[PDB]
Write a protein that binds this ligand. Sequence first.
Ligand code: NA
Ligand code: NA
Lengths: 459, 471
Amino acid sequence: MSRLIVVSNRVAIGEDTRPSAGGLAVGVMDALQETGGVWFGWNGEIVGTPDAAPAIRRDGNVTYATVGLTRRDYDQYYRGFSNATLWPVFHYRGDLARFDRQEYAGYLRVNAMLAKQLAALLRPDDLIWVHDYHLLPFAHALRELGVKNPIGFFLHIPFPSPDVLRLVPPHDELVKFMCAYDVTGFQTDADRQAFTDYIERRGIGTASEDGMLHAHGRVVKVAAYPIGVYPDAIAQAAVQYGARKPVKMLRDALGGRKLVMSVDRLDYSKGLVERFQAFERMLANAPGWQGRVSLVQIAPPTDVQTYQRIRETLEGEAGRINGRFSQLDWTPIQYLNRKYERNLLMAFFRMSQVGYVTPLRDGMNLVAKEYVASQDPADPGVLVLSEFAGAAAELTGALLVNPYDLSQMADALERALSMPLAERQARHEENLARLRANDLSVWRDTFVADLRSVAAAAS
Amino acid sequence: HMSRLIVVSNRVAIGEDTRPSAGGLAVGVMDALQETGGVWFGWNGEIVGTPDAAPAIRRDGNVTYATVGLTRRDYDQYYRGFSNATLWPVFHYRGDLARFDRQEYAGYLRVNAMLAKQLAALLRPDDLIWVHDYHLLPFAHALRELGVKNPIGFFLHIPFPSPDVLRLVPPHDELVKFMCAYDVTGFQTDADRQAFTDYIERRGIGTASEDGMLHAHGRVVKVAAYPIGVYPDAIAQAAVQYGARKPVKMLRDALGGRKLVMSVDRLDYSKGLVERFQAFERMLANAPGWQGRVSLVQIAPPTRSDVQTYQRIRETLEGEAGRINGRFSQLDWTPIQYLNRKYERNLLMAFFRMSQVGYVTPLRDGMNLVAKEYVASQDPADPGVLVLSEFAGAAAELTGALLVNPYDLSQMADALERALSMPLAERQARHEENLARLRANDLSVWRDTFVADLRSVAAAASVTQRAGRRI
Ligand code: NA
Ligand code: NA
């Protein structure tokens, strides 16, 4: 069969290929194995001059084709247009966007540079699957090199409505790049419709009866493929890690007090000051909960200036809140800037009574799904979920909140902590059924099936 | 005889100018109030200790002015609460500036309900009611709760955001229910109209019928765009009439033959005034031959109301002007004249006519009448060039402007340079293109079409109210 060629930010190396490490590898590895495929991308290293060609490593049936990045290439890929302009606008934080023509040129340049590195490895029937917004121009660069392969794109972050997308000055050129793919996939129907609205309402193209989009002289399959999880594997890990030292230490320190879990990387889409302040407001509104519940916020370390500014802000907010309420043997907010292995987080989730997942905007949010899947069905926790996370379209048993009303989040936390078992179980089973009906293999299998349909129609 | 038009808005000003060259809501509605012997209801601009028992009644010719004072508490809940802290920033696509507060939202509903009860006692059954802008969005719903069955129309003067952005307002569903209490809901542009329609249709609230009406919340709503225009011939005449005034002569002498870029904005976060200044700076850096040969005049009529925002923006702009003037100024050249001053309207038109470029690039604007006033002021024998933000409502009409994305400073700088050097023939082609649009949608079109749609509501209700023989 035709090889699957995965193109992404970072090729998983070594221990990062274990399913317990999560990440893109667990999503694509079965398909790479089935097809004898190739995973192409960065090796995580900075090199003094550009690599002549990708380094080649084979593990069983899968080939890993990796390059280093020079300082300039790294800066143009990670510290330029994609994170200064695309990321904030697509997360509805365009007040933070800063467009720069030279950075945009560098974004195009590094994409063309990587496409040139990949093209020499391709067989004409390889199925190419490109992941996320740093690589949006990748198919277009391949088309300019004469690549006629099936190419698919999956966008892991939101796609904004046309009014918001236009905050990115080259929006029309970006949409042209997205039409260089044969398949363009999004997390949710709302993302898919935003892209379709841009094409249709600006007179760029039309939807045919089959649902395909005809735009920029090409025919594009446009669909939503919401990324799920493996709920049975998560539940098993949640159980298996319940006696590990970090879990026991938290269990012991809580002394039977209730636990709210929250896990986020530090960026301005997460609303973490709001997260802390709504927990503060809950304790002020219902002081009977003081001394009886703690919030644990975990942030894996990761823009050095943005990360450090948020971390200092949150350290100050946690310190202020704790100074207002803390008692003997009670810390209201435990803010941990640490990387725990995924399976430990699942054990933390299972122990907790509330999962507090309220980003201001999120393309999906896998923590919300992992939280549900970790719960003991005989005593399950309650998910409090932002309506602006993609997962909200699926997790209909969550307590949904608009994080722009701090009192809504405070009210939801109080309701979650007080919820009778029978309702917690009804909501849990409702969410778990949805997780089981759209597990991670659905994303992989349906997207690959659509790439194969391109090839079938091609022949 | 015809039914009274009842205008409901923020402020009833005594004896405001309503000549065609004038500005303000009065010039937009006065002809309709005079023609129908109507009533203008709203605030008298005064603070009172306790709520007014009933509105004061003043007649001027054929028009009645029905006004109340506001207590400090009512003033704060109307002007310094939910409308300006939450609605205004979200509708201008600045969710990051919004600060929702439940008690402020309750206060917004409360003052609308209070004002509606004051109006209701003055109504006759056939009155046509026309409510203006976002501070009064819940007004029809409050009237309906009082049993008012009159035709009621709403016109939103600011943008209406797409549903993904509207949902940043936590009570968005209730606000849209309020908007469906109107028989007519009018917007500045087709995009605003479509954003509202998108909310209704895609969220399963209601449906569009064949005639384009919206069926939602048990009501039938006419949803349409009525872009607000100006009287361009009146503006041009006023500009010429003021061409000899001392300040015009003063400015011309101060320029010393230099080209003039004009910009006039109130200070708020939708205007992008930092970007405005920085793109002018970038143009002077990119095309240094323009140094000493062009000046930017930025006029910002003071609006000390919302003191924190006004002072913060003013401080930021003073720093930017200080930096840019420090970079480029010479012995006899101030690159950016930044004037926190109020000028007579007709003087501004004369300044527009003198200038070569109108620089109107807000980050977001429901319409922007300065852009239309700029074009209307030009001498067609040597007309200036309008540089216009694509996020201003007027961009849908002023197709002869150099349209720019104000988030792209280099594009704005390039447009300024192109505008300043544009050959006469192209300047005239663009000017006449824009002027023809202004003349085909002058301010009377807004007034006449909206009032006609209110009258159509009344006529339809009359048709279904009877089935028996007539004549
Ligand atoms: Na639990
Ligand atoms: Na002029």
